[PDB]
Symmetry: C4
């Protein structure tokens, strides 16, 4: 179903936290 | 619902802007 | 709708090409 | 359809593995 889709999208909106913070890991190794 | 799914997908299509520009942050630190 | 959702998902499956190749930009600047 | 959407989302939840591990490629080149 639709609710077990919305509750994947809200896994992606975790991966796009852990995307951003583990880029900002790299950026704060570089400047 | 379907419209509150399409309006997550259009959050992901923000994260995949902030993905691209904060890679291009790193690429422009490196070359 | 459902088809104009599947045809966002197949934008994300472009961003997750341009994700991979513009990481592999950075990896090939580094090793 | 809905099942051929859930089975894109579970492609994205592969890309967000290959996201994480090919960042952690870069992080382990840098520290």
């Amino acid at each position: 179903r639709m609710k077990x889709i919305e509750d994947k999208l809200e896994e992606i909106x975790s991966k796009x936290y852990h995307x951003e913070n583990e880029l900002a890991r790299i950026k704060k190794l570089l400047x």
